[PDB]
Design a protein around this ligand. Structure first.
Ligand SMILES: *[C@@H]1O[C@H](CO)[C@@H](O[C@@H]2O[C@H](CO)[C@@H](O)[C@H](O)[C@H]2NC(C)=O)[C@H](O)[C@H]1NC(C)=O
Ligand SMILES: *[C@@H]1O[C@H](CO)[C@@H](O[C@@H]2O[C@H](CO)[C@@H](O)[C@H](O)[C@H]2NC(C)=O)[C@H](O)[C@H]1NC(C)=O
Ligand SMILES: *[C@@H]1O[C@H](CO)[C@@H](O[C@@H]2O[C@H](CO)[C@@H](O)[C@H](O)[C@H]2NC(C)=O)[C@H](O)[C@H]1NC(C)=O
Lengths: 109, 49
């Protein structure tokens, strides 16, 4: 887990090999690429309740709001499953209003 | 690791708190206090040195 100990970037595993009077290591590393940059926000408050992401980050391509992990990009719609509520949006800086979907009401009708 | 990627500072500190166990709500509810404490500490280290 300690960075830049063996490899360059995120380490996965290594193989040892012999040598005349030494040893040789073959590290395997994982490196991201093909970047994009979007508009973000710290937390989303709906109906006076400020939902925060469990693990990940909010992003937006311009017209919709999604939650994605940090080291890879895949969009998931926002529901009350992957977000948790704490307080109200009156002191956090950068809150953006929106709507949050829930499954219980559609599945209860 | 690779190419540098921009990230606002508030979310970087939120991630760094989330790393050590404390949830990320603490930073977003106590931003001004933390900023003032950090400024005071970095001011006093100057005089101490
Ligand atoms: C991230 O978005 C910016 C848009 O501002 C893209 O281009 C940048 O443009 C500004 C303004 O001229 C420059 O100062 C930056 O150096 C540019 N970024 C570069 C060259 O990496 C930028 O391409 C986007 N990042 C991507 C597509 O990876
Ligand atoms: C941002 O992404 C969303 C999610 O895909 C887009 O919303 C829909 O995108 C699909 C294509 O996957 C279209 O078929 C729908 O018509 C879109 N719906 C709406 C209401 O636009 C959205 O278009 C994307 N926005 C931008 C600027 O790329
Ligand atoms: C997000 O939208 C809500 C719904 O309108 C806003 O809440 C009210 O917005 C009106 C018009 O901006 C204000 O006159 C009211 O004072 C707002 N009420 C409350 C309780 O805030 C809310 O302000 C919007 N959020 C942002 C950041 O603009």
């Amino acid at each position: 887990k300690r960075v830049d100990f063996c490899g360059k970037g995120y380490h996965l595993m290594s193989f040892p090999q012999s040598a005349p009077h030494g040893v040789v290591f073959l590290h395997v590393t994982y490196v991201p690429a093909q970047e994009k940059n979007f508009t973000t926000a710290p937390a989303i408050c709906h109906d006076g309740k400020a939902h925060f992401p469990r693990e990940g980050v909010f992003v937006s391509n311009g017209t919709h709001w999604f939650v994605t992990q940090r080291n890879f990009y895949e969009p998931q719609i926002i529901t009350t499953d992957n977000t948790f509520v704490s307080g109200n949006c009156d002191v956090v800086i950068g809150i953006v209003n929106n709507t949050v979907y829930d499954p219980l009401q559609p599945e209860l009708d | 690791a690779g190419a540098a990627l921009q990230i606002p500072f508030a979310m970087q500190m939120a991630y760094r708190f989330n790393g050590i166990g404390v949830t990320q709500n603490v930073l977003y509810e106590n931003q001004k206090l933390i900023a003032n404490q950090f400024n005071s500490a970095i001011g006093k280290i100057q005089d101490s040195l």
